[PDB]
C-alpha cells in the first residue's frame, strides 16, 4: 500500500501519446517525482512534479494535491522511451512505486514474416530458427516443450537505412525440430514463408 | 563527473563478507543505500547525512554502513547469505530527500555453494542463405547457454570495432529449467549488415561476452576448470559463399 | 485479429485524463470512429476519427494512416465516463472492437472505512453487513466459502450534499457469520471501525 | 423518438418461435442486427438496405429477416435454441455502414428446460443505529435474490416517487451457485440519505424489482406458481430508532 | 444588483494565484456554480460550490451562506486559464452572473523589445509596425492618430521551444509614419530597438 | 456527442424570420435558451421541461418556440429587427434548473439595412530582416479589414496544414470608426517560426479568412459584389532573401 | 526588485476573500514568512510558510519553490484585517519586501446618505459639515477650492450596537458654503438628505 | 517581558545628535536595527551577533551603534540631516535571521530649521440635531489643525475613560498646502454614540490630541511660545438641548 500505480503493461504504436497516473494514501506528502528505468540498469530521473503542473517537453506531469494522485503524459512515444517508469512520493522518508512498464513498438512498413535456418559455425551443426520482420502486432509466446527455448521479440534497427524489423529465436537440442514446427504453440501471421532445402 | 558505484557484479559464499562502495564526484550530503527486488519498488537500508550518519529502512540483516569521508558512503554485509542476493543502487541527494543521482548498480548473488556457478557457452549462427536471397541481408544469431549467475554482458565487434548499429540483445537472461530456483540461464543476441556486406570476406564478425564469476583466492575444488571473470567468444569470417 | 485493442482495465483517479489506441491491420480502411458504451446498455457514438486530427472537446482523437493506428485521449475524467469504450473500422464491412473498458474512480476527501450490520425488515433477521466509506484504493474480494456472497465496491453519490462515498456488502446464511469476520479475505484499513451492541 | 428496439428481455424454450422489432424513425436507408457476447466485438447477423435485403455477417444457425416497411426491421428465429442466448442490438444509419444509432437492446435467454426460472425475493434492509451516529447519515439496503435469468430492474422509491440521486446498484448479478453454469442470481442494492430523512417516519421506503420471465401462454407444469413477468417489492417506514 | 460580482479585469502574471469573489442577495438560494467561458465561447461548468467548500484541484471553491459570498481560487495560474468566469446561483430558476475576466498575463525571461517594420506581399505594401518581446510589465496603448490603428498585447506560444513572446500590431494610411513614431502613445522600455533601413 | 446548435452565424434584415436549432443528444428532458449581451449576464428567452413547454424568463419580443421531438427545440422570430442582434446560447439539462450543457453559440446581426455589410480584405506581411537577423526567428503578420459584421474564422495553413502553434489571433475585432455604431471591423494575426524554416523556399505560408454575409434568397442592388459567404486568403512563400 | 511584492493597495468588501503574492529571485532561499503590520505600528510574525501549504486557520499560506511564488489567503476577510501584509523570506540575510496594504471596507447594510451641520463649541463655530451613511459603493474625493478642506472617508465600529458607520468631514474658511455644496466634487448619491434648517 | 524600545517620538535640527534605546528582555544574541520609508519595505542599518558587533544592512551616513551589555543594542547619529526623517525600528532575535521581534518604533524628524514647528488646535462640534432626529444616533467631531509633523495620538475620553468603541480617525493627515513639503498637517476624528446617550448631560466627552514637538532644552528664538510636546484637549458636555 502506500503507493499504487498502473499495472500491467502499456505496449503502444510508436507515435501514440501514455498517460501514468500514480495515487498517494498520505496527505501529508511533500514532493513527487517521475523515474524511469531502462532494463536492467538504474533509476534516473525524469520529472519533478509540480503542484502547478509542468509544460516542457513532450513529457507532461501535474500534481492534484486534493485527490492525491500525480500524472505523467508522454505525447508522440518513441521506441527510447520503452521503459519502467517509477512513481516517487516523499512521505516523510520517500516511497518507490514498483512501476509501470511501457514498450513503444515500432511499426513495420512492409512486414513480410519469416523463419529462416541459420547453421552453427565451428561444427556440431546444432540449431536456431530465426523468426523476423514481422509486424508488431504478431505476439509470440512459450512452447508446449521445455527442452526448446524460445526468446521474446527484439526490435532492430539499422541506422543507415532506417530500417527496422522485430525478431524472435527460439533453439532445442537436435530432437530434431525443425523452423517450421518451431513456435506451433504462438499466433504466427497467415503468410509465414518456410524455407526448406 | 558522476555518481559511481562498485563493483558491478560479485557472487559471495554464505558467511563470507564484502564492502560495496558509492563515490560521489558531486560533494553532496546525503547518500543512500536501497535494495532492489521483484515485485516490490526499492527499499533502504542505510543512508547518510554527513559524515556520522546512519539510520533506517530495513536494517537487518547484516546491512552496516560508514560514512568516514563525504564522497563515501560504504555499505558492508559482514555475514553475506541467501536472501540478501539481489540488486543494489545507490543515491546521492542535495536535498534532504529530494532529486536522487542513482549509481549504475550491484548484482550480488550469494550462493551457499561455488559449485553451481557455471561460465556461458557461446556460439556464432551464421545466416542462413535464404535470408540474402530474399531480403538481401544477413543476420548473425548470437547464443549463451549453461552459465549462472545472469551476470554477462553481450556484445558484437566487426573488424576490431564494438558495434550497436543493428543490434539487439534479449533484456533479460532465459531460464533453461523456469521451475528451478537456481536455473541455468540463456541468452540470445541479434546483428543484421547487408547482404553484400556479407559476401565481403574480408569482413569480420565476433560476439563477445563477458561472464562474471568466481575470483582468484576463491576455494574451488571441483573437477571443472575455476569458474573465474572471463571473456568467452565466437566468429564467423566473411562468405561470399 | 483485424482490430486489437488496448487490454486490461484502465481504472483511474477521477480528476485524470486518459489514453485509448487502437491497431488496424487492413491498411486500405475507410472509416474510423470512437463508441462508448455504459454497462449495460448500447453502443453511442463519441468521435469520428480523421487523420485532421480532432478537437471537441475534452476529447482528442486522431488518425496516423501511417501508422495504421487510431487514439483517444479523454482528459479531465468525470465519473461518469466509467463505460466500455470500442474503436470501429470500416473496412469494406466495418469491424467492431472488442472493447476497453474505463472505471473512473472517486477520490475519497474524508476516508472512514466501517462495516456496520443493518437488521431485516418483518423478522428472521438474516442479517447483512455493509463495507463503506473505505478509500478508493482498497479492493473488496469474494470469500472463501461458497455459501458466503460478497459484492464489489459500489461508488455510490449523494449530489445535494457534494459528497461520494465507497460501498460494497456481503451477508450469508447464519453460519453463524458475523460482521467481525466478514471481509477476512480483503485488505482492509488498519482501523476499520467494528460496531457491536 | 429515436431507435425503439422491443422487447427488452425474453426466456425461451429450446424450438420456439418469437421476433425481434426494430422501431426506425431517422427515416434510414440502412438497418442492421447485431449479436454481442462476452469475449468478443458485435457480430453481424444479417442487414437491409430499403424494404428488400438480407446476407452478411453470419446468419447460421436459425436467423430468418425481414424488411417490409422501411422503418421495421424484424429479426427472428423459428427454433431458439442455445446457443442464441445473447444480448441483441438492432441499428440504424443513413450512411451505408457509416455513423449508426443503436436500440436499447435485447437480452434474450434460451434454455431448454424452463423449470429452473425464478421470480425474484426482493428484502429491504434498515441502516445500522452504530451508523447513524457516526456518520449522521443512513443506508438501506435492498436485496434480490435467488432468480433467473439475471432479466430484472432494480428501483428504489421514495414517497411514490423514484429517486436516482444516492442510489448505487450493482452493475452485476452475483452466482449463488457459481459452479453450476445456470446458477440462481443476486443482487444488491444502497440507498443512503441523511439521517435527518430515514428518522422522520412519514418517509416511505419502498425497493422495487422489476422481473421478465414466463409469459401466458407458456407451458408450465410444476407443483410451484408460475415464474411470470411480475413485480417484487419490499417497504420499509423511517423510524425514530 | 442580485448576483453582483467582481468586477473589471483580472491582468495577473503567470505564477500567482487569484480570488473571485461574487456575492447574492436572495438569502434562500439554493445551489451555485461556477462556469467558465474563453473568448467567445459557450460557458463550460466549472465547479459546484457547496458549503462545506470544494476540493480538487489547483481550483478551489466555497461558499458562506451567512455574509452571503461565493468565492473561487485558482493558485498557480497558466495561460490557459485567460477566459471569463461567472457566478450561477439558483435559488428559484437560476440567475447567471455577469462573470469577470481572467487576463494571465505570461512571464518573460529574456526579453529585448523591438519595433520592426513588415513590408507587404503583392504590392502597394501599406505599411505594418510590429512592437514585440517585451515583458509584460509592458502597456500598449491605443494611438493619438485615427487614420492608425494599434492591437493591444497578444500572446504567443512556440510550443517546439517551450518560447513565449509578447506582441502588439500596429498599421496606417501612408501619412506617412514610420515605425519609430508609432508608438509615441505609448510607454517604450528606454532600450527598445529600432532599426530603419 | 454534445449539445449542437446551428447556425453559427447570420445576417437578418428587419422584418426576416429564422429558425436556430439546438439538438440534444443526451436524452435529457430540460432545456433552455439564452440571450447574451454586454454587461449583463445571461438572460433566459424559453424552456422546456418535457416535449411541451414554454413561457418564463423574457420572451417578447419575437422569440417562438418549439419542441415536438425533445431532442430538438427550435427558437425562431418571426420578425427581426434592431435590436435582437446578440449571441444566443442554447443548452441542455437532465436536472431542472441545475448543471447545464451549453452548445458552440450563435452570433446573429440584424440590420434595418444590409448595404453595411462588408466582407474583409486578407493581406499577408513578410518578416522583417531587422528581426531575423537579431532574433533568428520570423513573424508573419495577416490583417483582415473593413469587414462587417464580425463574424469571420481566421487560420494559418502551413503547407496545407492549419497550425494553431506559433500563432496568435487577436481575442477581439477592432473598430476602423470608434465613433460610428456600425463600424468596419479589423482583425491582425501573428505566426512565428525558426528562421531556417522562413527562408526555406519549399515551405508555403497562407492565410485563410472565413467570411459569413448574406445568404442566397437576398437582395442586392449595390454596385458592389453581394458580400455573401466567402473564403478571403492571402499567401506567402519562403523567402531564401 | 529583489523580493517583488503586490503593488499598491487592496481595498476589500468586509465578507471578501483576498490574495496575497509574493515573487523572490533566489532559487536556494531556505525558509519563507508572513509578517502583519498594523497602522501604524510594529512587524509581528503572522505564518511561516511551508511547501505543504499551511493551516490555519481562515488565514492560508502557500509556497511553491519551483515557480518561485509566495501567497497568503484570507478567506472572509473581517475589517479587523486591515493591515500592511509583509511577505519576508530568509535568503541568507532574512529579506522584507515592501509589503501591501489591505483595506477591508465594512458592508453597509442598510445606508441612508445624509449631510448633517454640527455647529461648534467655544466661538468662531467656523464650519463643520458631516457626511455619513453611505455604502461602501460611494466614493469620496478631495476638493477645487483649497482654501476648503475634505477627509477622506474613514471606517467607525459601534461594536456594543454591532453597527458600522461611514464618514467623511468638510470644512472651510468662511467663504462662505454649507452642507449642500460641501461634497460637490464626489460622486454624491440621488438620495442624500440635506437638513438645511 | 519583551522588547522595548526607546524614544518614540522626537525633533531635531540638522547637525544635532540623539540615540536610540532599544532593551532586550528574553535574553536573545541577535539584534538587529531597521528603517523604514514610503515606497520600499524595511531596510536593515546594523546589527549583532553577540556582544562587539556592527556593520551590514546598509549604515551611511552617520548612523553608528554600539553593543555591550547584549541586552542593550544602542542606535545614534553624530550629525542628524534630512533624510535621516524616517521611522526606525529596533529587532531583537533569538537564533539566527529567523523569527524576529520588533519593538514598538520611533518616529524622528530632522529639519533644518524648528522654526516651522506648529502644535495642533483641537475643538469639538456638537452633533447636528438634524442626525438625532432621523438616525437617532448622535456624531460628535473633532478637529487638530497647524500641526507639523504628524507626531500625534488622537484619543476620545468620555468620563474620563477612553473609548475605542465607535470611534474612528483619519489614517492619514491631510496636508493643508499640497504644495508645500512642510506643509502644515491636519487630522479629524469621529464618535458616534447613540441618541439618547449625548443626551445624557453627566455625560462628559473629551477629544484629546497628545502632540510631541520640541523639548525643555530646545534653542528658541520666535516670538511666538514654544512648540513643545504637549496634550490639546477639546470639550463637550451632554446636552439635552
Known amino acids: 500500500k502506500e503507493v499504487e500505480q498502473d499495472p500491467g503493461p502499456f505496449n503502444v504504436p510508436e507515435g501514440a501519446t501514455v498517460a501514468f497516473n500514480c495515487t498517494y494514501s498520505?496527505?501529508?506528502?511533500?514532493?513527487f517525482f517521475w523515474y524511469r528505468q531502462d532494463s536492467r540498469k538504474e533509476p534516473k530521473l525524469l520529472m519533478s512534479?509540480?503542484?502547478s503542473g509542468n509544460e516542457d517537453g513532450r513529457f507532461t506531469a501535474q500534481l492534484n494535491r486534493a485527490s492525491q494522485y500525480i500524472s505523467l503524459l508522454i505525447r508522440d512515444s518513441k521506441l527510447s522511451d520503452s521503459a519502467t517508469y517509477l512513481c516517487?512520493?516523499?512521505?516523510?522518508?520517500?516511497?518507490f512505486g514498483q512501476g509501470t512498464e511501457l514498450s513503444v513498438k515500432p511499426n513495420i512498413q512492409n512486414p513480410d514474416p519469416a523463419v529462416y535456418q541459420l547453421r552453427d559455425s565451428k561444427s556440431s551443426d546444432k540449431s536456431v530458427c530465426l523468426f523476423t520482420d514481422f509486424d508488431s502486432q504478431t505476439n509470440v509466446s512459450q512452447s508446449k516443450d521445455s527442452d526448446v527455448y524460445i526468446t521474446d521479440k527484439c526490435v532492430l534497427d539499422m541506422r543507415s537505412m532506417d530500417f527496422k524489423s522485430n525478431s524472435a529465436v527460439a533453439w532445442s537440442n537436435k530432437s530434431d525440430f525443425a523452423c517450421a514446427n518451431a513456435f506451433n504453440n504462438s499466433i504466427i501471421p497467415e503468410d509465414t514463408f518456410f524455407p526448406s532445402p | 563527473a558522476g555518481v559511481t558505484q562498485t563493483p558491478k557484479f560479485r557472487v559471495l559464499k554464505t558467511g563470507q563478507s564484502m564492502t560495496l562502495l558509492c563515490a560521489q564526484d558531486?560533494?553532496?550530503?546525503?547518500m543512500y543505500w536501497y535494495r532492489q527486488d521483484p515485485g516490490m519498488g526499492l527499499r533502504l537500508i542505510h543512508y547518510?547525512?554527513?559524515?556520522?550518519?546512519?539510520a533506517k529502512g530495513e536494517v537487518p540483516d547484516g546491512y552496516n554502513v560508514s560514512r568516514l569521508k563525504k564522497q563515501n558512503f560504504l555499505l558492508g554485509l559482514e555475514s553475506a547469505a541467501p536472501s540478501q542476493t539481489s540488486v543494489y543502487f545507490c543515491?546521492?541527494?542535495?536535498?534532504?530527500?529530494?532529486?536522487?543521482?542513482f549509481g549504475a548498480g550491484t548484482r550480488l548473488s550469494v550462493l551457499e555453494d561455488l559449485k553451481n556457478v557455471f561460465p556461458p557457452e557461446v556460439a556464432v549462427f551464421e545466416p542462413s542463405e535464404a535470408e540474402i536471397s530474399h531480403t538481401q541481408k544477413a543476420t548473425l544469431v548470437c547464443l549463451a547457454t549453461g552459465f549462472y549467475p545472469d551476470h554477462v554482458e553481450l556484445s558484437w565487434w566487426v573488424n576490431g570495432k564494438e558495434v550497436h548499429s543493428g543490434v539487439c540483445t534479449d533484456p533479460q537472461p532465459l531460464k533453461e529449467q523456469p521451475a528451478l530456483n537456481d536455473s541455468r540461464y540463456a541468452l540470445s543476441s541479434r546483428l543484421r549488415v547487408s547482404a553484400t556486406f556479407w559476401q565481403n570476406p574480408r569482413n569480420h564478425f565476433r560476439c563477445q561476452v563477458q561472464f562474471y564469476g568466481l575470483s582468484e583466492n576463491d576455494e574451488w575444488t571441483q573437477d571443472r576448470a575455476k569458474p573465474v571473470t572471463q571473456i568467452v567468444s565466437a566468429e564467423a569470417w566473411g562468405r561470399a559463399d | 485479429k483485424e482490430v486489437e485493442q488496448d487490454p486490461g482495465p484502465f481504472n483511474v483517479p477521477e480528476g485524470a485524463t486518459v489514453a485509448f489506441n487502437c491497431?488496424?491491420?487492413?491498411?486500405?480502411?475507410?472509416?474510423?470512429?470512437?463508441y462508448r458504451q455504459d454497462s449495460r446498455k448500447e453502443p453511442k457514438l463519441?468521435?469520428?476519427?480523421?487523420?485532421?486530427?480532432?478537437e471537441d472537446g475534452r476529447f482528442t482523437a486522431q488518425l496516423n494512416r501511417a501508422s495504421q493506428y487510431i487514439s483517444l485521449l479523454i482528459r479531465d475524467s468525470k465519473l461518469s465516463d466509467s463505460a466500455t469504450?470500442?474503436?470501429?473500422?470500416?473496412?469494406?464491412?466495418?469491424?467492431?472492437?472488442?472493447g476497453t473498458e474505463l472505471s473512473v474512480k472517486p477520490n475519497i476527501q474524508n476516508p472512514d472505512p466501517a462495516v456496520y450490520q443493518l437488521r431485516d425488515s418483518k423478522s428472521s433477521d438474516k442479517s447483512v453487513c455493509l463495507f463503506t466509506d473505505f478509500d478508493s484504493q482498497t479492493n473488496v474480494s469474494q470469500s472463501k466459502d461458497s455459501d458466503v456472497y460478497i459484492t464489489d465496491k459500489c461508488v455510490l453519490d449523494m449530489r445535494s450534499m457534494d459528497f461520494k462515498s465507497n460501498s460494497a456488502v456481503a451477508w450469508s446464511n447464519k453460519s453463524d457469520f458475523a460482521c467481525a469476520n466478514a471481509f477476512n479475505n480483503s485488505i482492509i484499513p488498519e482501523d476499520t471501525f467494528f460496531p457491536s451492541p | 423518438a429515436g431507435v425503439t428496439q422491443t422487447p427488452k428481455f425474453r426466456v425461451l424454450k429450446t424450438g420456439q418461435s418469437m421476433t425481434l422489432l426494430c422501431?426506425?424513425?431517422?427515416?434510414?436507408?440502412?438497418?442492421?442486427?447485431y449479436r454481442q457476447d462476452p469475449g468478443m466485438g458485435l457480430r453481424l447477423?444479417?442487414?437491409?438496405?430499403?424494404?428488400?435485403?438480407?446476407?452478411?455477417?453470419e446468419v447460421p444457425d436459425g436467423y430468418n429477416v425481414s424488411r417490409l416497411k422501411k422503418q421495421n426491421f424484424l429479426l427472428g428465429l423459428e427454433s431458439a435454441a442455445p446457443s442464441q442466448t445473447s444480448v441483441?442490438?438492432?441499428?440504424?444509419?443513413?450512411?451505408?455502414?457509416?455513423?449508426?444509432?443503436?436500440?436499447?437492446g435485447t437480452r434474450l435467454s434460451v434454455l431448454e428446460d424452463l423449470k429452473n426460472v425464478f421470480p425474484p425475493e426482493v428484502a429491504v434492509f434498515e441502516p445500522s443505529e452504530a451508523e447513524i451516529s457516526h456518520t449522521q447519515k443512513a443506508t438501506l439496503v435492498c436485496l434480490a435474490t435467488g432468480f433467473y435469468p439475471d432479466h430484472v430492474e432494480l428501483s428504489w422509491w421514495v414517497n411514490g416517487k423514484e429517486v436516482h440521486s444516492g442510489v448505487c446498484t450493482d452493475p452485476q448479478p452475483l452466482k449463488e451457485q457459481p459452479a453450476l453454469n445456470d446458477s440462481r442470481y443476486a443482487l444488491s442494492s444502497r440507498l443512503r440519505v441523511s439521517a435527518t430523512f430515514w428518522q422522520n417516519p412519514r418517509n416511505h421506503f419502498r425497493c422495487q424489482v422489476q422481473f421478465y420471465g414466463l409469459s401466458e401462454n407458456d407451458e408450465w407444469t410444476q407443483d410451484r406458481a408460475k415464474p411470470v413477468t411480475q413485480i417484487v417489492s419490499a417497504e420499509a417506514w423511517g423510524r425514530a430508532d | 444588483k442580485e448576483v453582483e460580482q467582481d468586477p473589471g479585469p483580472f491582468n495577473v502574471p503567470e505564477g500567482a494565484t487569484v480570488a473571485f469573489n461574487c456575492?447574492?442577495?436572495?438569502?434562500?438560494?439554493?445551489?451555485?456554480?461556477?462556469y467558465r467561458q474563453d473568448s467567445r465561447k459557450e460557458p463550460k461548468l466549472?465547479?459546484?460550490?457547496?458549503?462545506?467548500?470544494?476540493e480538487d484541484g489547483r481550483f478551489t471553491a466555497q461558499l458562506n451562506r451567512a455574509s452571503q459570498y461565493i468565492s473561487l481560487l485558482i493558485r498557480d495560474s497558466k495561460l490557459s486559464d485567460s477566459a471569463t468566469?461567472?457566478?450561477?446561483?439558483?435559488?428559484?430558476?437560476?440567475?447567471?452572473?455577469?462573470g469577470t475576466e481572467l487576463s494571465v498575463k505570461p512571464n518573460i525571461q529574456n526579453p529585448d523589445p523591438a519595433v520592426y517594420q513588415l513590408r507587404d506581399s503583392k504590392s502597394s505594401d501599406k505599411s505594418v509596425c510590429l512592437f514585440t518581446d517585451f515583458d509584460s510589465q509592458t502597456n500598449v496603448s491605443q494611438s493619438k492618430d485615427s487614420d492608425v490603428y494599434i492591437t493591444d498585447k497578444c500572446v504567443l506560444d512556440m510550443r517546439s521551444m517551450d518560447f513565449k513572446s509578447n506582441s502588439a500590431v500596429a498599421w496606417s494610411n501612408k501619412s506617412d509614419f514610420a515605425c519609430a513614431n508609432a508608438f509615441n502613445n505609448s510607454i517604450i522600455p528606454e532600450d527598445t530597438f529600432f532599426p530603419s533601413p | 456527442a454534445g449539445v449542437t446548435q446551428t447556425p453559427k452565424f447570420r445576417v437578418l434584415k428587419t422584418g426576416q424570420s429564422m429558425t436556430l436549432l439546438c439538438?440534444?443528444?443526451?436524452?435529457?428532458?430540460?432545456?433552455?435558451?439564452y440571450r447574451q449581451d454586454p454587461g449583463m449576464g445571461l438572460r433566459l428567452?424559453?424552456?422546456?421541461?418535457?416535449?411541451?413547454?414554454?413561457?418564463?424568463?423574457e420572451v417578447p419580443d419575437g422569440y417562438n418556440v418549439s419542441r415536438l421531438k425533445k431532442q430538438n427545440f427550435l427558437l425562431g422570430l418571426e420578425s427581426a429587427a434592431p435590436s435582437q442582434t446578440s449571441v444566443?446560447?442554447?443548452?441542455?439539462?437532465?436536472?431542472?434548473?441545475?448543471?447545464?450543457?451549453?452548445?458552440?453559440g450563435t452570433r446573429l446581426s440584424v440590420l434595418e439595412d444590409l448595404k453595411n455589410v462588408f466582407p474583409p480584405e486578407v493581406a499577408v506581411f513578410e518578416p522583417s530582416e531587422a528581426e531575423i537577423s537579431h532574433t533568428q526567428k520570423a513573424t508573419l503578420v495577416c490583417l483582415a479589414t473593413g469587414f462587417y459584421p464580425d463574424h469571420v474564422e481566421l487560420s494559418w495553413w502551413v503547407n496545407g496544414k492549419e497550425v494553431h502553434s506559433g500563432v496568435c489571433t487577436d481575442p477581439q475585432p477592432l473598430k476602423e470608426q470608434p465613433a460610428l455604431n456600425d463600424s468596419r471591423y479589423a482583425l491582425s494575426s501573428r505566426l512565428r517560426v525558426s528562421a531556417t524554416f522562413w527562408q526555406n523556399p519549399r515551405n508555403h505560408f497562407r492565410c485563410q479568412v472565413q467570411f459569413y454575409g448574406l445568404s442566397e434568397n437576398d437582395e442586392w442592388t449595390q454596385d458592389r459584389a453581394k458580400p455573401v459567404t466567402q473564403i478571403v486568403s492571402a499567401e506567402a512563400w519562403g523567402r531564401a532573401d | 526588485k529583489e523580493v517583488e511584492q503586490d503593488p499598491g493597495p487592496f481595498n476589500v468588501p468586509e465578507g471578501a476573500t483576498v490574495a496575497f503574492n509574493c515573487?523572490?529571485?533566489?532559487?536556494?532561499?531556505?525558509?519563507?514568512?508572513?509578517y502583519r503590520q498594523d497602522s501604524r505600528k510594529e512587524p509581528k510574525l503572522?505564518?511561516?510558510?511551508?511547501?505543504?501549504?499551511?493551516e490555519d486557520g481562515r488565514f492560508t499560506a502557500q509556497l511553491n519553490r519551483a515557480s518561485q511564488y509566495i501567497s497568503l489567503l484570507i478567506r472572509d476577510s473581517k475589517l479587523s484585517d486591515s493591515a500592511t501584509?509583509?511577505?519576508?523570506?530568509?535568503?541568507?540575510?532574512?529579506?522584507?519586501?515592501?509589503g501591501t496594504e489591505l483595506s477591508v471596507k465594512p458592508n453597509i447594510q442598510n445606508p441612508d446618505p445624509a449631510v448633517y451641520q454640527l455647529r461648534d463649541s467655544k466661538s468662531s463655530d467656523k464650519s463643520v459639515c458631516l457626511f455619513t451613511d453611505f455604502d461602501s459603493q460611494t466614493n469620496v474625493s478631495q476638493s477645487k477650492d483649497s482654501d476648503v478642506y475634505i477627509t477622506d472617508k474613514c471606517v467607525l465600529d459601534m461594536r456594543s450596537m454591532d453597527f458600522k458607520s461611514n464618514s467623511a468631514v468638510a470644512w472651510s474658511n468662511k467663504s462662505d458654503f454649507a452642507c449642500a455644496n460641501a461634497f460637490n466634487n464626489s460622486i454624491i448619491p440621488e438620495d442624500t438628505f440635506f437638513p438645511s434648517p | 517581558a519583551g522588547v522595548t524600545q526607546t524614544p518614540k517620538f522626537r525633533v531635531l535640527k540638522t547637525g544635532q545628535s540623539m540615540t536610540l534605546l532599544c532593551?532586550?528582555?528574553?535574553?536573545?544574541?541577535?539584534?538587529?536595527?531597521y528603517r523604514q520609508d514610503p515606497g520600499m519595505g524595511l531596510r536593515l542599518?546594523?546589527?549583532?551577533?553577540?556582544?562587539?558587533?556592527?556593520?551590514?544592512?546598509e549604515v551611511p551616513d552617520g548612523y553608528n551603534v554600539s553593543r555591550l551589555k547584549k541586552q542593550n543594542f544602542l542606535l545614534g547619529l553624530e550629525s542628524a540631516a534630512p533624510s535621516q526623517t524616517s521611522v526606525?525600528?529596533?529587532?531583537?532575535?533569538?537564533?539566527?535571521?529567523?523569527?524576529?521581534?520588533?519593538?514598538?518604533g520611533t518616529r524622528l524628524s530632522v529639519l533644518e530649521d524648528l522654526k516651522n514647528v506648529f502644535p495642533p488646535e483641537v475643538a469639538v462640534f456638537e452633533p447636528s440635531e438634524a442626525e438625532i432626529s432621523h438616525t437617532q444616533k448622535a456624531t460628535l467631531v473633532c478637529l487638530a489643525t497647524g500641526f507639523y509633523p504628524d507626531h500625534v495620538e488622537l484619543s476620545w475620553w468620555v468620563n474620563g475613560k477612553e473609548v475605542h468603541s465607535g470611534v474612528c480617525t483619519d489614517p492619514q493627515p491631510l496636508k493643508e498646502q499640497p504644495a508645500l513639503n512642510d506643509s502644515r498637517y491636519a487630522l479629524s476624528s469621529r464618535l458616534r454614540v447613540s441618541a439618547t446617550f449625548w443626551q445624557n448631560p453627566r455625560n462628559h466627552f473629551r477629544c484629546q490630541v497628545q502632540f510631541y514637538g520640541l523639548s525643555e532644552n530646545d534653542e528658541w528664538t520666535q516670538d511666538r511660545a514654544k512648540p513643545v510636546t504637549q496634550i490639546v484637549s477639546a470639550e463637550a458636555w451632554g446636552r439635552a438641548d
Open positions: 543515491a546521492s541527494g542535495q536535498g534532504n530527500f529530494d532529486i536522487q543521482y
Open positions: 498520505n496527505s501529508a506528502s511533500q514532493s
Open positions: 512534479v509540480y503542484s
Open positions: 516517487v512520493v516523499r512521505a516523510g522518508k520517500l516511497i
Open positions: 558531486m560533494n553532496h550530503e546525503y
Open positions: 547518510s547525512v554527513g559524515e556520522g550518519t546512519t
